[PDB]
C-alpha cells in the first residue's frame, strides 16, 4: 500500500491519475498537508521541493521537475536557446526578449518582415506597433496549409520524463487546426479556446489526430508523418531536455521527479518543423486521457512503486 497527496485540484490530467491510483486498491490518498506520502501531485506555483525527501523510511516522488520552468517560460526558453552552447539553432524561430535586454538587437534584425509578440497577442508588420515582459518572435509567414480549407494548424506532443530521465514520446499527437482559411493580410491563432469562440467543420473540435493527418500527407504530398515531421519533432524534444538534464536531474537526489510536458510545433510549407513553446502543466485530448494517464502510472509511478504507448527517445 502506497500513499499520495493531491495539491492541484485544477489538473485534469492528474485528476485521472489519482482516480486510477485509487482504483488499484494499493494507493491511499492522504490529506494535502500530510507529510508521510510516497507520491506528490504538486501545485503549479511555489511547489515546496525543499521539504521533499526528508521523511525517513519513505521513498518520495513528485510529478514536477524542479528547474523545468527554464524550458516552459517564454523569456526563459529564448534565453536558454541563445546562451546554451548545445542549442546555439535551425528549429527555433528568431526571438528577442523585450521589457516594457535585446531591443536594439531586435531592431538590427528588423532592418518578409512580419513578427509576433506574446508572453493578449499582437501580430504586426511594423515594429513600432509591437513595442507600443514579452518576447518578439519571427512569424512563420508560409505555414503548411491543410486542404480542403487552406487553413493553419499546430501539433501538440506529450512527453513524459521519468525519474531515470528516460524520455518517452506519446504515440498519439493532436493537430489543433484552424477552421478558417489562412489570410496573409482567428485563422492565425490555432488555440482551442480562440477557435471555440465555422468551428468543427472539417474535423471534430478542430482536432485532427495522427491517423488522419498521416493519411493526408500520403494522399496529398506522397510522404508519411514519421519521415516528414516526426523525425524533426523527436530531435527537438531530445535536444531541449538533454540540455537542461544536468540542471534538473534527480539521479543522485534525496527525492525523485518526473513530469509531463506539452511540446507545440509548427510546420511550414517546406515540411520543416519549428518549436513554438513547451508547456509544464499541459492538458490532454479528450479521447486520449485514458491511454495517456494509464501510461503515466505504468511508466512514471509504478516503476518506482510496483504493484507500449510510448517511444523511448534514447540518449
Amino acid at each position: 500500500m502506497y500513499t499520495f497527496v493531491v495539491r492541484d485540484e485544477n489538473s485534469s490530467v492528474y485528476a485521472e491519475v489519482s482516480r486510477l491510483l485509487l482504483a488499484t486498491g494499493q494507493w491511499k490518498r492522504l490529506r494535502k498537508d500530510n507529510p508521510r506520502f510516497n507520491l506528490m501531485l504538486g501545485e503549479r506555483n511555489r511547489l515546496p521541493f525543499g521539504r521533499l525527501g526528508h521523511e525517513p523510511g519513505l521513498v518520495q516522488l513528485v510529478n514536477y521537475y524542479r528547474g523545468a520552468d527554464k524550458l516552459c517560460r517564454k523569456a526563459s526558453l529564448v534565453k536558454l536557446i541563445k546562451t546554451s552552447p548545445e542549442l546555439s539553432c535551425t528549429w527555433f524561430p528568431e526571438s528577442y526578449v523585450i521589457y516594457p535586454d535585446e531591443r536594439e538587437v531586435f531592431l538590427a534584425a528588423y532592418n518578409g518582415n512580419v513578427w509576433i509578440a506574446k508572453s493578449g497577442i499582437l501580430i504586426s508588420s511594423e515594429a513600432s506597433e509591437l513595442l507600443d515582459v514579452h518576447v518578439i518572435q519571427k512569424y512563420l509567414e508560409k505555414p503548411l496549409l491543410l486542404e480542403p480549407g487552406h487553413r493553419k494548424f499546430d501539433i501538440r506532443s506529450w512527453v513524459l520524463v521519468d525519474h531515470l530521465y528516460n524520455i518517452y514520446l506519446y504515440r498519439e499527437g493532436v493537430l489543433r487546426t484552424s477552421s478558417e482559411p489562412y489570410n496573409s493580410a482567428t485563422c492565425h491563432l490555432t488555440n482551442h479556446c480562440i477557435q471555440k469562440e465555422n468551428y468543427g467543420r472539417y474535423e471534430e473540435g478542430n482536432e485532427m489526430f495522427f491517423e488522419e493527418f498521416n493519411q493526408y500527407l500520403m494522399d496529398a504530398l506522397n510522404t508519411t508523418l514519421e519521415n516528414s515531421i516526426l523525425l524533426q519533432i523527436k530531435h527537438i524534444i531530445r535536444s531541449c531536455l538533454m540540455c537542461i538534464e544536468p540542471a534538473i536531474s534527480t539521479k543522485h537526489l534525496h527525492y525523485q521527479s518526473f513530469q509531463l510536458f506539452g511540446f507545440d510545433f509548427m510546420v511550414d510549407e517546406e515540411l520543416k518543423v519549428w518549436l513554438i513553446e513547451v508547456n509544464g502543466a499541459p492538458a490532454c485530448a479528450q479521447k486520449l486521457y485514458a491511454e495517456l494517464c494509464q501510461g503515466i502510472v505504468d511508466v512514471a509511478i509504478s516503476s518506482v512503486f510496483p504493484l507500449s504507448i510510448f517511444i523511448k527517445l534514447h540518449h
Binding site: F49, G50, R51, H54, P56, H252
Partner: protein, 437 residues
C-alpha cells in the same frame, strides 16, 4: 600567533568536542597526557598549534577549551576519559539538573544561575592569550542547553569581547536521532537570539551525517560515536588552517571575509569527500578530480539541499593530502562545463583553494579508512535556506495550536518571543530568496 578558545555547550557540543580534540591530538602528535615530543620550545611558544593549545612548565599541551553542560553525566566521562590529563577541572563546568529539552529553561531559568561562572572560567583562558582571535562554539539546536544556554552565552560574549569573532558549529535536528518533539521550537528560538552575535555558523544536519554513515560506511544503525567521528573530520578540515602553517583562513576574521559577504547570511554549506569504510579490504584511491567533483553531489553535503537551484556567494576548497594546484585547476575547469554553478552577479565566479600536504588522520579503530587525499568544500549557497524552510514549517504546524508552548511560558518566557523569533526567520528566508533569485 593569535589564540582561539573553543566552547562546548550541552551533550552534542561536549561529545563532538571530545572527538575533535582527540583528532587534534593525533594530528599534532600530542599524547593523552598532553605531552608532545615534537615540541622543542618547552613551556611556551607561538607556533601555529599554540592557537588551540597552551603549554605548561612540565611540557603539557592543554586545550584552550571550556566544556559546559547543565547536567554532569556527559562531562563526567571527560573527567574519567582517555584524555583526562589533557584538561584541568576549571575547564569542565557541570550543573545538576538539565534544561529538559526546553530552550526557556536553559536560557532563563537555569542559565541565569551559571552564566557568570562560565564567563569567569572563559575569562581565565582569555587572560592566557597574548592576542585572542575569538571563540568557536559547539552546540545543538534541539537541546535545551545547546539552544537555550548558548544564546545567553553568545549575548554576553558580545558584551565582554565586542571586538572578537565568534564561529558556530551547529547540529541541525533530525528525527532519526532526535530526542524531543519540541526541537523545531528550540532551533528557531536560538537562531533568532544568536544571529546578530554569530559571524559564521557551520550547520550539520544529523540526517545527512546519518545517511553518509549508512551509505558510505555500511553502518546499519549509526550511533553518536559514528556521527561524531565523521563530524570531527569536517571540523578538523575547517580549523586546520588555524592550527597549521598556511596563508588561507589563518585567522577567524578571514572566515567572515572569504565566506560571509552579508552578515545575516553566514551559514556556509560544507561538503566532504571521500568517505571510505575501513572495513572495505581495498579501495581505489580517488583522484583530485574525482573528490572535487564529489563536492557537488548532495549526498556528500552536511545539509541535504540542491545548490543547483540557488546561487553561490563564495566557495572555498580545502584539500588535505597529495594535491597540487595543477590538478585542482584541471578539475575545476572540467566541473565548470558540467555542473550548474551560478554565482550572484555581484560576486566573482571563482574559488579560494587551500592545500595541506599532511593527509587526513583517522582515529585508529574507527570506521573511516585512510586516504591519500581529501577535500572539504565551504560554499555559501542560498540553497541551504531549504533547511530553514523545513524547520520553519514544522514550527508553524505546532505553534498554530500552541502545542507545548506552556512549557516555555511556565519558565518565564512570553508567547511573543515565539512569533518574534519566527518573524526573524521569515525575514531570513526572504533575504535568501532575494539573493538566490
Amino acid at each position: 600567533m593569535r589564540e582561539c578558545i573553543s566552547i562546548h555547550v550541552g551533550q552534542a557540543g561536549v561529545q563532538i568536542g571530545n572527538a575533535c580534540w582527540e583528532l587534534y591530538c593525533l594530528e599534532h602528535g600530542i599524547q593523552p597526557d598532553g605531552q608532545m615530543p615534537s615540541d622543542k620550545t618547552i613551556g611556551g611558544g607561538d607556533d601555529s598549534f599554540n592557537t588551540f593549545f597552551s603549554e605548561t612548565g612540565a611540557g603539557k599541551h592543554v586545550p584552550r577549551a571550556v566544556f559546559v553542560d547543565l547536567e554532569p553525566t556527559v562531562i563526567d566521562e571527560v573527567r574519567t576519559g582517555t584524555y583526562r590529563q589533557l584538561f584541568h577541572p576549571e575547564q569542565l563546568i557541570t550543573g545538576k539538573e538539565d534544561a529538559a529539552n526546553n530552550y526557556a529553561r536553559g536560557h532563563y531559568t537555569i542559565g541565569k544561575e551559571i552564566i557568570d561562572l562560565v564567563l569567569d572560567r572563559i575569562r581565565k583562558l582569555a587572560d592566557q592569550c597574548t592576542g585572542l582571535q575569538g571563540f568557536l562554539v559547539f552546540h545543538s539546536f534541539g537541546g535545551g542547553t545547546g539552544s537555550g544556554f548558548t544564546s545567553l552565552l553568545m549575548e554576553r560574549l558580545s558584551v565582554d569581547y565586542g571586538k572578537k569573532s565568534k564561529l558556530e558549529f551547529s547540529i541541525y535536528p533530525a528525527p532519526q536521532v532526535s530526542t524531543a518533539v519540541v526541537e523545531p521550537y528550540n532551533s528557531i528560538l536560538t537562531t533568532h537570539t544568536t544571529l546578530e552575535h554569530s559571524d559564521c555558523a557551520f550547520m550539520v544536519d544529523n540526517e545527512a551525517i546519518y545517511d553518509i554513515c549508512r551509505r558510505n560506511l555500511d553502518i546499519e544503525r549509526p550511533t553518536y560515536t559514528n556521527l561524531n567521528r565523521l563530524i570531527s573530520q569536517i571540523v578538523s578540515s575547517i580549523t586546520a588552517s588555524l592550527r597549521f602553517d598556511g596563508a588561507l583562513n589563518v585567522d577567524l576574521t578571514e572566515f567572515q571575509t572569504n565566506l560571509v559577504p552579508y552578515p545575516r547570511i553566514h551559514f556556509p554549506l560544507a561538503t566532504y569527500a571521500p568517505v571510505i569504510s575501513a572495513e572495505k579490504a581495498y579501495h581505489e584511491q580517488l583522484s583530485v578530480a574525482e573528490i572535487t567533483n564529489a563536492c557537488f553531489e548532495p549526498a556528500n553535503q552536511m545539509v541535504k539541499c540542491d545548490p543547483r537551484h540557488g546561487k553561490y556567494m563564495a566557495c572555498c576548497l580545502l584539500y588535505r593530502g597529495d594535491v597540487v594546484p595543477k590538478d585542482v585547476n584541471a578539475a575545476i575547469a572540467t566541473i565548470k562545463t558540467k555542473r550548474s554553478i551560478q554565482f550572484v552577479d555581484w560576486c566573482p565566479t571563482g574559488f579560494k583553494v587551500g592545500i595541506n600536504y599532511q593527509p587526513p588522520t583517522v582515529v585508529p579503530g574507527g570506521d573511516l579508512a585512510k586516504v591519500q587525499r581529501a577535500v572539504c568544500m565551504l560554499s555559501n549557497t542560498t540553497a541551504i535556506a531549504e533547511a530553514w524552510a523545513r524547520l520553519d514549517h514544522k514550527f508553524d504546524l505546532m505553534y498554530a495550536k500552541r502545542a507545548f508552548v506552556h512549557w516555555y511560558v511556565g519558565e518565564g518566557m512570553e508567547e511573543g518571543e515565539f512569533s518574534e523569533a519566527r518573524e526573524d526567520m521569515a525575514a531570513l528566508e526572504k533575504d535568501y530568496e532575494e539573493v538566490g533569485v
